[PDB]
């Protein structure tokens, strides 16, 4: 595991990049190393045969919503785990790395959608949304809303708005 933690830049939440780690004898030797599926008692001796590795940048207070079977703005519209989760959810803070003078605007999180998300599903499409009757052929600002909002991530806030990197490995068989 050398490619998915020391990466210079991470993706947003409205999208996210994962991988298909395989054929490597995962040195799980490798801060909230919270693991759900199988505890690290025997994580160094297994026969999993297939592993994924996602990547996400989110506010600290919203990290709890990553865990399966919970509701939230980013867990009900951006990324939701199934009820039978088998993996681990690692996460630390990036207070002095992702934060930037006057803040960073590159990160985003979807705010509106038609319906909830199914597990392990993403949708990247910036279009006007929302209505009763939707005669919104043009682009306007009443009930026709830009779906994404950018985090603040100012150079210095108190804990709770600072950026946390969270990686959610999804084991398999």
């Amino acid at each position: 595991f050398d490619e998915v933690f020391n990466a210079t830049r991470f993706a947003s939440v409205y999208a996210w990049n994962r991988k298909r780690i395989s054929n490597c004898v995962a040195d799980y030797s490798v801060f909230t190393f919270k693991c759900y599926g199988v505890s690290p008692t025997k994580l160094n001796d297994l026969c999993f045969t297939n592993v994924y590795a996602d990547s996400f940048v989110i506010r600290g207070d919203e990290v709890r919503q990553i865990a399966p079977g919970q509701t939230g703005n980013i867990a009900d519209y951006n990324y939701k785990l199934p009820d039978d989760f088998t993996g681990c959810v690692i996460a630390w803070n990036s207070n002095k790395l992702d934060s930037k003078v006057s803040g960073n605007y590159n990160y985003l999180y979807r705010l509106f959608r038609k319906s909830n998300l199914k597990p392990f599903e993403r949708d990247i499409s910036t279009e006007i949304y929302q209505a009763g009757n939707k005669p919104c052929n043009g682009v306007a600002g009443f009930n026709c809303y830009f779906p994404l909002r950018s985090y603040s991530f100012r150079p210095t806030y108190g804990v709770g708005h600072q950026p946390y990197r969270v990686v959610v490995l999804s084991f398999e068989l």
Partner: antibody
Amino acid sequence: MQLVQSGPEVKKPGSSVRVSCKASGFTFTPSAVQWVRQARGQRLEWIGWIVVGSGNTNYAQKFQERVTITRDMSTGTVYMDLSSLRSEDTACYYCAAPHCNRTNCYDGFDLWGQGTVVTV
Amino acid sequence: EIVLTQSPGTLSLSPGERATLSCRASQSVSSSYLAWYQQKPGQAPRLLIYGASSRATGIPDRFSGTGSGTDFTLTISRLEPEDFAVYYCQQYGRSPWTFGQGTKVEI
């Protein structure tokens, strides 16, 4: 199902006033709440509006530099801040939002608050 | 920017009659973004029409609304004594937002 607004306030010229429009269900639900002023016997006059979701806001050019509409998700509160009070502002202030619970929204503005009287 | 004019200024008709009101604009306004309000002395405004053609829930059918382009109108078929009030026309399609002047109906 209704809007709650603070009681009357008293201010002298040059100060600033904060008015709270507190609703229920605003969080997690799109809701475009506007702000309208009305003096005694005069026509209604528009002030501002804000989207509870994204923070998007727009102010009248005249009332620019004098109006600040601020949002609070946790408490489901909306703040209307006015600075440098002038006698012409002495009027009743209403906050109106459309019926919005099921993601979608009633396009028209239907709910209206009880109003607040501000005099200076 | 958009200027709305409401006429007639005052009306004086007995209960049961038919009254008509005109709301005129200065630029094209989408017919899906116009509304009317009713105001009685001291109370909060009430929503009557949304979209210029859809009556709000529960309001009497005697109300009616049509129009397009830069001129919209409201018509009330059978008036009653409690309807004596002042009605404001609001176009709510294009920022900046705007209201009307007002009207009065009595006998």
